[PDB]
Ligand binder design. Structure first.
Ligand SMILES: CCCCCCCCCCCCCCCCCC(=O)OC[C@H](COP(=O)([O-])OCC(O)COP(=O)([O-])OC[C@@H](COC(=O)CCCCCCCCCCCCCCCCC)OC(=O)CCCCCCCCCCCCCCCCC)OC(=O)CCCCCCCCCCCCCCCCC
Ligand SMILES: CCCCCCCC/C=C/CCCCCCCC(=O)OC[C@H](COP(=O)(O)OCCN)OC(=O)CCCCCCC/C=C/CCCCCCCC
Ligand SMILES: CN(C)C(=N)NC(=N)N
Ligand code: SF4
Ligand code: SF4
Ligand code: SF4
Ligand code: SF4
Ligand code: FES
Ligand SMILES: [Mg+2]
Ligand SMILES: [Zn+2]
Lengths: 176, 48, 114, 230, 97, 112, 96, 376, 208, 124
């Protein structure tokens, strides 16, 4: 079905003609627009008091990255390179070798945050929940090099945000 | 917290005047909050 | 095998089109130097036009010549209409590229390139 | 003289004694396999290559069944698909969940043939089997929970390398592959067991954990360590 | 919202509508940020029997396009790509604005 | 009769039946120059005679539009004009001749 | 378990440390080098060994669906402990 | 230029202020999206479509997903289809708000911009709650949707839809009957129906010119054949008529959103086929087949049977099409993206004949061009 | 019920097959092949010089009113003698249908411009020329549309590198942006993804 | 319809730099089967790829850098003649490697139990 947005004709009776002439000479619809803006003036503003107030977020929010640990302190990442394989932008560089104790662990884990598109495929592809996208989004730097995270930086982010990251994963892990 | 205010303005933080070793009387950042209060303020949970 | 000609049929008509395009480019260099405020000479511009024409002097297929003159007309109209900037006109001159060595000994010294 | 056989109704002339697998190969169809290697003997125990003959009530082992005159080999029939699904179900029922920590990873025949010929779901609601890992030297790393008892390494060891220190001990679901003693499988042709093992049970120890198959670039060169010119 | 009664009256008179009925600011009427744990369904293929992938394989039922006519290889009525599209009906809900 | 056709740039015709008859007769005359065995000629002659029979049988515009199933009568007239121009061009092109040239051996193979 | 190189530079858990004559140390002047203080190898060594009276045990890292893929470790060799290789966790049978 | 949307170079010849010709120079936002898509797999190429028309993001995702599922010969589950339709209509509301407010801002009016962008902020919150990304969600995928809705999303969407017709009414109070707006828009950029069809216009351009055509009604996709809505039809084919059509399309999208909320069915969210869509995390961490399929899907990707398809949807800016060619591998062989704004910008020169500079600005606004999708 | 498999439309398949036979009969001079894919898409393969007659027929004929040019692209297949495959997507609003018309050409062979049948062909053919090097004979204004000014090479060809050969930076010595040979801080990591096990037997080619 | 008695050559139209037109030797070949798998589906199409050039280590982050535009460029061809024709018309030098197919082998399960031959297996 369909409807005509503009196919109405005005009546030509004297009362309607006089009303249209009054609208032409006396700017009725212009005063109407003025009244609408005055109403909005007296309404309550919709501005938050940043940075003392923050907009709502969800447990699914994708922000700054982090590498997690097991509750015993061991790193979760096992150098499986699934995140490196699935990364759309090829932002992850991983190099690994057997550790001293024989574990499969990474020696290099780089994420170029200027190449990352913050899509969250890496945390979907991780089989051990090692790499996650934390809730942090205020991590702007003053130089380009500071956005080239390495394994030490990501582990520090994980250790710093572990409580909030664990809470978000607990909240949203039943939908995954 | 003030639930009477409209959503978004119902929670707020007054930052400290000195954090770690930097004087933050006027220079207040949005990253000065610990992660738990960060989650509480950004409303990923209703429990402080 | 008979093939569909773009223009020019045989090679002589392709050469005629080449000469017409060369005249059009030759009469445009002073205006280009004036409008773009280039610091190069008019002689330098004409020499660059000549050099860019000469690097295709080994072509023997009339269709390839026709395509070359079509592209030359395109890049000439990008210059007459000032669609190009001074940046592109000077990109023709490689003013910032370092001179790559060409002798075997220098190439051996610099690196592994053939 | 050549005998005429049919693969999916297409005629093909094969020499007598040719197997169903080789006839399908001649017509261009590669039958799934785990224990069959053309350089080794025919074992026929993984049962992954079962195919249906048009009139036969019973599926045959394609890798070991010679073709007869006028056979129609239904490679993509319902019986063949169900047979492949059942065999893959058994294999993955006992296999361990070690793909991310497994060097075989993206170049695993169990994974590829599971993705092409098997089901997408698991019905195994029991406990799995865990097997003690053996040590056979500094070159080959054995994680024998991933073994699928295809006996390729045994056949290769004996037939090719002339070394008879590999075999199966025990029987039943507890059947194990190993030396039964602390013996190192040291030979000049040891890494070929790393190559022929279809799963990650036998993996290169110097290459352990370093890379994944999809990352690497393959350069086709020759060998200079000896005068054979491999 | 929090406002004086006179201010509300002036807003309603100027705008011409009862604004408190349709407010653009959310006051406790939204869902809580914490919810009970869900339990999502499984699906149609989570059976333990009579569930063979060969009978539910979408990709393997794809076929190469059928060659209707190939150069290499009574009075028929003229045909159309499809039956002509029927004329639309004018909306009953609100035919004109 | 109707004020507008509802389509921008398409005017209303006061004489739809006469214009349709003229256009269909012109189309039929043009098709007479096409060879009899040409597959193009038979089909368009059939559809034109089918539509020419309808326009000479129904005097009401609305009923004729419903019977033709081609939209509005102005759209039908426009389609008749397009068909006439195509008939002239096809008379020039002569597409009923055998195939110009078969493609190379592997020209439509896919995947490849 | 951080360690200090002879040049005064901290050593990462991967053993990274710039050489004495390496020019790349200039990037750390007037700035700092990012090294994580916690060493996962040290912590997992600090973890104890769980004794279970079964030949085969299963580890999922703890948390169930929040851990790692469940794997089964065979505790038959009495000369060493069985290690879950996802989480590096050691298990043993009650001896003596 | 404020009116040039950032990456349009319009080389104009003016006699005085009358426009003699328009020569749109595009490609200032050409990135090589199609070449990069050729180099990525099918799952890795989804965000590329997310970033093409960055004002109708879930609509682009839906078009790409429909094309890939048509090639794969699979079917999304009913709940996934209803979620797709619901978020497609929410995306249409977002896009039409952006279009109308930016058009009015190029004209000179800004208060509606601010109001309707507050509404856009609320819809962005919906996007972020389902997906975690405020705009580039990458939520609609071949086989269904990535995740299920949280347990309050439908209630909040109901509240938003309940309080939105008043916002549209306030928008109309400032523009619909305003004589200044009527003077600026009426009889500007008139395009005839035949010209629109030949030049290749689609969507609001055709409907404003008066052609009764809509893909959601004629060639339905997902569950658009189970919802009732009206298709606005213009009469004069100008900027004012296209503005009226867009406002009425916002109201009809409100209708569709209400129907989707009331008819949301239970069930799963992605095709129950682990060879195309990934299994759940618990199954991946307990089942060997599920772990294998997770590994293979996220490293190599599913293979798509060879073939070429052209699938189009009624995106908010017109017909958005994808011509996808697969050679049987895990990566697309060819992917041509047909953006509706390409043809409209091609037709910009004809529409601006005999007009002035401000008229050309209004014509660009009424065409509603996004140069991300124009240039690709 | 088979909830995970796309249902098929045999009625539409039959309609498309009938119309393909119809057009192949009407235009034997140019039409070389007609196909219907199993998801109901009609595809017509013609001789490259039949573009104008075939498209004019499909636009003006009463039983095929394909008044809208949905799309116009090309596909580069190096293994063919005529590598470029020009594809026309047409939409008929009268019969609520869509059709595809495919022709072939190589680097040096022009294709007649269809700006006289559809007006969108102007920018579509400009883009085809810009990205593939295919020349269109009677084009009102043929030039680059998407690439940079003075850009050399046609990027969408299969033999063109992903990152091209030049890159841009601002040089302070000359006070302008300059073009220099491409040099990457990190090289694009090429992944070999194809599995060595055949996935779809229905598409298997003869061993030859 | 004109007739040209010339070899096709489009190097002047491709836009490739003269260095990468002249100093490049592509390799036309059928890829060898990956020994780690028994599948043979990747050994059916010819490939054309360029010779390897220098890759060095980035001073920052230690990544692998390159300066060769054609390092990742691999083309797929259905036939050796098609691949050679493409290489010739684009002007690159080329080395062609003939396809290697396994020779047919006589397999018999009954040979595992020969009465007097050495093919008898000591285990199963
Ligand atoms: C000339 C008007 C003089 C009176 C006046 O300003 O009345 C404002 C007062 C504001 O009422 P409202 O807008 O309902 O306040 C919102 C809530 O009541 C919530 O109000 P609130 O809790 O935000 O109020 C905070 C309080 C204190 O606020 C402040 O101190 C901040 C502003 C300081 C301004 C100096 O505001 C006032 O005292 C308002 C009057 C300021 C006079 C200057 O308006 C009236 O009393 C009606 C005026 C009708 C005019 C026609
Ligand atoms: C001192 C403070 C005054 C404050 C007044 C504020 C008014 C509200 C302010 C908002 C308006 C500002 C933005 C509006 C600017 C544009 C307004 C506008 O368009 O007005 C022009 C308006 C529109 O014309 P069109 O629609 O284009 O029709 C043309 C047909 N060919 O036309 C006008 O000329 C109206 C101007 C007012 C005319 C005065 C009314 C005349 C009535 C006469 C009766 C009295 C006769 C006196 C004799 C008495 C005998 C006893
Ligand atoms: C950049 N984009 C998308 C805009 N709409 N820009 C604008 N200035 N209106
Ligand atoms: S969020 Fe996406 S783009 Fe960023 S590192 Fe993860 S996979 Fe790569
Ligand atoms: S997917 Fe997870 S375990 Fe695998 S390499 Fe990436 S972060 Fe490590
Ligand atoms: S052998 Fe194959 S299936 Fe088994 S864990 Fe390794 S990669 Fe996975
Ligand atoms: S170790 Fe490998 S080669 Fe040996 S039987 Fe087991 S799966 Fe086969
Ligand atoms: S391959 Fe034949 S049974 Fe194993
Ligand atoms: Mg191995
Ligand atoms: Zn564990």
């Amino acid at each position: 079905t369909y409807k005509f947005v503009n196919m109405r004709e005005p009546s030509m009776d004297m009362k309607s003609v006089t009303d249209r002439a009054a609208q032409t000479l006396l700017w009725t619809e212009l005063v109407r627009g003025l009244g609408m803006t005055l109403s909005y003036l007296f309404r309550e503003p919709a501005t938050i008091n940043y940075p003392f107030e923050k907009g709502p977020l969800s447990p699914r929010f994708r922000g700054e990255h982090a590498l997690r640990r097991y509750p015993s302190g061991e790193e979760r990442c096992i150098a499986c390179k699934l995140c490196e394989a699935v990364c759309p932008a090829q932002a992850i560089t991983i190099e690994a070798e057997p550790r001293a104790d024989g574990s499969r662990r990474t020696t290099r884990y780089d994420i170029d945050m200027t190449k990352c598109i913050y899509c969250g495929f890496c945390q979907e592809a991780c089989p051990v929940d090692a790499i996650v996208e934390g809730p942090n989004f205020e991590f702007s730097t003053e130089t380009h090099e500071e956005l080239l995270y390495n394994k030490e930086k990501l582990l520090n982010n994980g250790d710093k945000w572990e409580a909030e990251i664990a809470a978000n994963i607990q909240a949203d892990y039943l939908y995954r | 917290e003030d639930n009477k205010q409209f959503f978004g303005r119902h929670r707020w933080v007054i930052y400290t005047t000195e954090m770690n070793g930097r004087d933050t009387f006027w220079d207040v950042d949005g990253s000065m909050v610990p992660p738990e209060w960060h989650r509480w303020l950004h409303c990923m949970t209703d429990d402080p | 095998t008979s093939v569909k000609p773009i223009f020019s049929r045989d090679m002589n008509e392709a050469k005629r089109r080449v000469r017409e395009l060369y005249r059009a480019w030759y009469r445009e260099v002073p205006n280009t130097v004036h409008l773009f405020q280039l610091d190069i000479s008019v002689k330098q511009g004409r020499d660059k036009v000549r050099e860019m024409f000469m690097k295709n002097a080994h072509v023997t297929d009339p269709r390839v010549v026709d395509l070359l003159v079509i592209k030359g007309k395109m890049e000439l109209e990008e210059t007459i209409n000032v669609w190009k900037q001074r940046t592109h006109i000077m990109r023709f001159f490689h003013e910032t590229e370092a001179p790559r060595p060409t002798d075997f000994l220098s190439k051996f010294y610099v690196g592994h390139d053939p | 003289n050549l005998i005429e056989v049919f693969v999916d109704g297409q005629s093909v002339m094969v020499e007598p004694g040719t197997t169903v697998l080789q006839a399908c190969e001649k017509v261009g169809m590669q039958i799934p396999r785990f224990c069959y290697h053309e350089r080794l003997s025919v074992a026929g125990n993984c049962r992954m290559c079962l195919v249906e003959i048009e009139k036969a009530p019973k599926v045959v082992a394609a890798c070991a069944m010679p073709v007869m005159k006028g056979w129609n080999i239904l490679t993509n029939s319902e019986k063949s698909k169900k047979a492949r699904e059942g065999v893959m179900e058994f294999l993955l029922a006992n296999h361990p969940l070690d793909c991310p920590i497994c060097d075989q990873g993206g170049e695993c025949d169990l994974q590829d043939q599971s993705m092409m010929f098997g089901s997408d779901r698991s019905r195994f609601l029991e406990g799995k089997r865990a097997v003690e890992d053996k040590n056979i030297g500094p070159l080959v790393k054995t994680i024998m929970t991933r073994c699928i008892q295809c006996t390729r390494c045994i056949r290769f060891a004996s037939e090719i390398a002339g070394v008879d220190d590999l075999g199966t001990t025990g029987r039943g679901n507890d059947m194990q592959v190993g030396t039964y003693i602390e013996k190192m499988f040291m030979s000049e042709l040891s890494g070929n067991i790393i190559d022929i093992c279809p799963v990650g049970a036998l993996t290169s120890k110097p290459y352990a954990f370093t890379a994944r198959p999809w990352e690497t670039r393959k350069t086709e060169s020759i060998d200079v360590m000896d005068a054979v010119g491999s | 919202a929090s406002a004086t009664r006179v201010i509300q009256l002036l807003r309603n008179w100027a705008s011409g509508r009862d604004l408190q009925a349709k407010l653009q600011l959310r006051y406790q009427e939204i869902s809580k940020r914490t919810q009970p744990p869900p339990k999502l369904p499984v699906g149609p293929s989570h059976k333990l029997s009579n569930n063979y992938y060969c009978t539910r394989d979408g990709r393997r039922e794809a076929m190469p396009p059928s060659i209707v006519m190939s150069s290499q290889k009574t009075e028929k009525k003229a045909v159309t790509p499809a039956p002509p599209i029927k004329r639309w009906e004018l909306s009953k809900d609100q035919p004109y604005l | 009769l109707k004020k507008t056709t509802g389509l921008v740039g398409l005017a209303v015709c006061e004489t739809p039946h006469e214009r349709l008859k003229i256009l269909y007769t012109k189309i039929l005359d043009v098709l007479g120059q096409i060879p009899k065995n040409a597959a193009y000629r038979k089909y368009t002659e059939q559809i034109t005679n089918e539509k020419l029979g309808m326009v000479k049988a129904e005097p009401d515009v609305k009923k004729l539009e419903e019977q033709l199933q081609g939209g509005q009568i102005e759209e039908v007239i426009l389609q008749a004009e397009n068909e006439l121009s195509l008939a002239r061009k096809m008379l020039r092109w002569k597409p009923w001749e055998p195939l110009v040239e078969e493609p190379p051996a592997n020209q439509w193979k896919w995947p490849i | 378990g951080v360690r200090t190189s002879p040049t005064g530079e901290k050593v990462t858990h991967t053993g990274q440390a710039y050489d004495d004559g390496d020019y790349r140390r200039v990037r750390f002047s007037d700035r700092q080098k990012e090294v994580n203080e916690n060493f996962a190898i040290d912590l997992i060594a600090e973890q104890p060994v769980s004794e279970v009276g079964s030949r085969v045990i299963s580890c999922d890292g703890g948390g169930g669906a929040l851990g790692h893929p469940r794997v089964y470790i065979n505790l038959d060799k009495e000369t060493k402990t069985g290690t879950c290789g996802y989480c590096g966790l050691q298990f043993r049978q009650p001896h003596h | 230029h404020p009116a040039a949307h950032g990456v349009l170079r319009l080389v104009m010849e003016l006699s005085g202020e009358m426009v003699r010709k328009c020569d749109p120079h595009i490609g200032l936002l050409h990135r090589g999206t199609e070449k990069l898509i050729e180099y990525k797999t099918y799952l890795q190429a989804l965000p590329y479509f997310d970033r093409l028309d960055y004002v109708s993001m879930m609509c682009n995702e839906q078009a790409y997903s429909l094309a890939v599922e048509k090639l794969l010969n699979i079917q999304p589950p009913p709940r996934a289809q209803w979620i797709r339709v619901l978020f497609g209509e929410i995306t249409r509301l977002l896009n039409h708000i952006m279009a109308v407010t930016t058009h009015a801002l190029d004209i000179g009016a800004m208060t509606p911009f601010f109001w309707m962008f507050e509404e856009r902020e609320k819809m962005f919150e919906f996007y972020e709650r389902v997906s975690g990304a405020r705009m580039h969600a990458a939520y609609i995928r071949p086989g269904g949707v990535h995740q299920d809705l949280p347990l309050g999303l439908l209630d909040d969407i109901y509240e938003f839809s309940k309080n939105f017709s008043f916002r549209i009414d306030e928008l109309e109070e400032m523009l619909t009957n305003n004589r200044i707006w009527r003077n600026r828009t009426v009889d500007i950029g008139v395009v005839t129906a035949e010209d629109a069809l030949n030049y290749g216009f689609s969507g609001v351009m055709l409907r404003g010119s008066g052609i009764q055509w809509d893909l959601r009604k004629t060639q339905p996709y997902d569950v658009y054949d189970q919802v009732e809505f009206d298709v606005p039809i213009g009469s004069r084919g100008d900027c004012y008529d296209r503005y009226l059509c867009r406002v009425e399309e916002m109201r009809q999208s409100l209708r569709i959103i209400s129907q989707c909320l009331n008819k949301m069915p239970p069930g799963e969210i992605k095709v129950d086929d682990a060879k195309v869509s990934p299994p759940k995390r618990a199954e991946m961490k307990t089942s060997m087949e599920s772990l294998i399929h997770h590994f293979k899907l996220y490293t190599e990707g599913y293979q798509v049977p060879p073939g070429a398809t052209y699938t189009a949807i009624e995106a908010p800016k017109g017909e958005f099409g994808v011509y996808l060619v697969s050679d049987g591998s895990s990566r697309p062989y060819r992917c041509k993206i047909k953006a509706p704004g390409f043809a409209h910008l091609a037709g910009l020169d004809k529409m601006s004949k005999g007009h002035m500079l401000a008229d050309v600005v209004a014509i660009i606004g009424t065409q509603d061009i996004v140069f991300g999708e124009v240039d690709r | 019920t088979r909830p995970t498999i796309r249902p098929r439309n045999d009625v539409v398949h039959k309609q498309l097959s009938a119309f393909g036979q119809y057009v192949a009969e009407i235009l034997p001079k140019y039409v070389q092949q007609v196909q219907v894919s199993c998801f109901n898409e009609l595809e017509i393969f013609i001789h490259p010089d039949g573009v104008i007659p075939v498209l004019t027929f499909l636009r003006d004929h009463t039983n095929a009113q394909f008044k809208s040019l949905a799309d116009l692209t090309a596909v580069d297949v190096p293994t063919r003698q005529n590598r470029f495959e020009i594809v026309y997507n047409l939409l008929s609003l009268r019969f609520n249908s869509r059709i595809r018309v495919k022709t072939y050409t190589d680097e040096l062979t022009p294709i007649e411009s269809s700006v006289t049948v559809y007006k969108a062909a102007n920018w579509y053919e400009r883009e085809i020329w810009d990205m593939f090097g295919v020349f269109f004979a009677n084009h009102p204004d043929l030039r680059r549309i998407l690439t940079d000014y003075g850009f050399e090479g046609h990027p969408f060809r299969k033999d063109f590198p992903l990152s091209g050969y030049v890159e841009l930076r601002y040089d302070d010595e000359v006070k302008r942006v300059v073009a220099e040979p491409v040099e990457l801080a990190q090289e694009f990591r090429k992944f070999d993804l194809n599995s060595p096990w055949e996935a779809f037997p229905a598409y298997r080619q003869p061993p030859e | 319809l004109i007739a040209v008695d010339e070899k096709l050559d489009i190097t002047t139209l491709t836009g490739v730099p003269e260095e990468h037109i002249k100093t490049r030797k592509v390799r036309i070949f059928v890829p060898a089967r990956n020994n780690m798998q028994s599948g043979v589906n990747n050994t059916k199409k010819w490939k054309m790829e360029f010779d390897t050039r220098e890759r060095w280590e980035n001073p920052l982050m230690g990544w692998s850098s390159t300066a060769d535009p054609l390092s990742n460029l691999v083309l797929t061809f259905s036939t050796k003649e098609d691949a050679v024709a493409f290489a010739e018309k684009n002007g690159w030098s080329f080395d062609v490697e003939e396809r290697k197919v396994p020779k047919p082998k006589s397999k018999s399960y009954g040979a595992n139990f020969s009465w007097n031959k050495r093919t008898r297996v000591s285990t199963k």
